[PDB]
Amino acid sequence: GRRPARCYRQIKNKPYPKSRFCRGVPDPKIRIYDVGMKKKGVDEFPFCVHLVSWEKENVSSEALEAARIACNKYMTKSAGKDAFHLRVRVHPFHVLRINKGMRGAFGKPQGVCARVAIGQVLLSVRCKDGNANHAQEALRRAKFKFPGRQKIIVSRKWGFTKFSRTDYLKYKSENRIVPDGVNAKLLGCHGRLAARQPGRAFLEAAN
Amino acid sequence: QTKKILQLLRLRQIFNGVFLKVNKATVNMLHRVEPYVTYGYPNLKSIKE
Amino acid sequence: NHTAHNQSYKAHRNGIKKPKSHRHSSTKGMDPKFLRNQRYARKHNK
């Protein structure tokens, strides 16, 4: 059946995505990229830990789903069904070809994989500070599902936002944070003045 | 390219040596043959000998 | 089938040869109306 992952581990060809030129591509194995309590507010899960790739390699869609399932199961048991939010940060958009002599050897589409780079985040989990140990352990199990070498890095940012935890509290105390579900919006000093609210108008940018 | 520049510097044989005035035109030529040459600032003794 | 290997080396053995440039260039292919008048101007030049 499917070839061993070593055959297409190295990035050797240009990107070959599904398009009007490449037809008959099988669907990716992974279809769900967010698991757990994905509706929790930005203020609920301050902690964030990433599983970061340390190699330049192809990661099959089959391995991505396996890592998500393995990480999801342990975190659910260890911490609970409503104590974490796991997000897969990589999407397989590259199509792999297979040549089933060498005359006309251009292969047919076999499957899909993701072209990962060095330092690129593979998986992200946000939860409360009390479940930091469980989150790191869950990512450790998922590491065995990937072909290359990964690394566990604890983020200094508030959940999935782009603000540092110190900055998030600094802005929130100043009333410059407008929750947007999992995201956080920072209020500046631009736009129509009438659009702002009495307590949400500022003269200087948030610096 | 290196072959042409070394010819313009009159360095056609290993361990041959020449003087060269310093200006942006000559320095940029020298930069393009860096691994094939070594150079520096000669003192009065060296020039005399 | 094809390759440009060694072709630049061959070209530089005796090249690159720039064409000889003369003070006066050929008038072939220039506007005949301009050329015809110029011929008459030289004819009556004194």
């Binding site: 990433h50 970061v52 330092g119 985040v121 690394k151 890095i153 604890v154 983020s155 200094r156 940012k157 782009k162 540092s164 | 310093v22 200006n23 942006k24 035109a25 000559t26 | 072709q7 061959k10 070209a11 530089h12 053995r13 005796n14 090249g15 690159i16 040869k17 720039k18 064409p19 260039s25 292919g29 220039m30 506007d31």
Partner: protein, 163 residues
């Protein structure tokens, strides 16, 4: 011919610039071209007549003929071990007056007067330009010194904006 059409591989070269399509400004049609002037060939994608082959795009040549709507341009072309003088006619929409010799005329006049001012006083000089030479010695007044040291490594900072 022989596997490639006249405009093959001109998707980017012959396309107009972003937000610079439509009517051609009329300063293009008010330019004056004389024999001996230098012009840069830049194909305008909207004008399909008198347009040069893709090779001559981005090349500078010398004007050798002038017609009602086009200028004859001489362009060098390297073929194997020779340089050929290719004479082509191009509509003026595809040519821009080149500033490759803009300094020559003004430089000659300055050289002529400098030599004239030196001839009257019997002082032989040279008007040649020279490349940037070495700087002379000088003193720099002391000021506060900011110390630079290597920074301790932090893995969290190995990403744009950090992890």
């Amino acid at each position: 011919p022989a596997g490639h059409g006249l405009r093959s591989r001109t998707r980017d070269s012959f396309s107009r610039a972003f937000r610079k399509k439509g009517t051609i400004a009329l300063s293009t049609y008010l330019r004056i071209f004389k024999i001996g002037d230098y012009v840069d060939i830049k194909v305008n994608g909207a004008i399909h007549k008198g347009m040069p082959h893709k090779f001559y795009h981005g090349r500078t040549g010398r004007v050798w003929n002038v017609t009602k709507r086009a200028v004859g341009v001489e362009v060098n072309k390297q073929v194997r071990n020779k340089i050929l003088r290719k004479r082509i006619h191009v509509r003026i929409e595809h040519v821009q007056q080149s500033r490759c010799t803009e300094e020559v005329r003004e430089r000659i006049k300055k050289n002529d007067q400098l030599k004239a001012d030196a001839k009257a006083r019997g002082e032989v000089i040279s008007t040649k330009r020279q490349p940037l030479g070495p700087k002379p010695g000088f003193m720099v007044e002391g000021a506060t010194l900011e110390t630079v040291t290597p920074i301790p490594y932090d893995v969290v900072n190995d990403l744009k904006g950090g992890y």
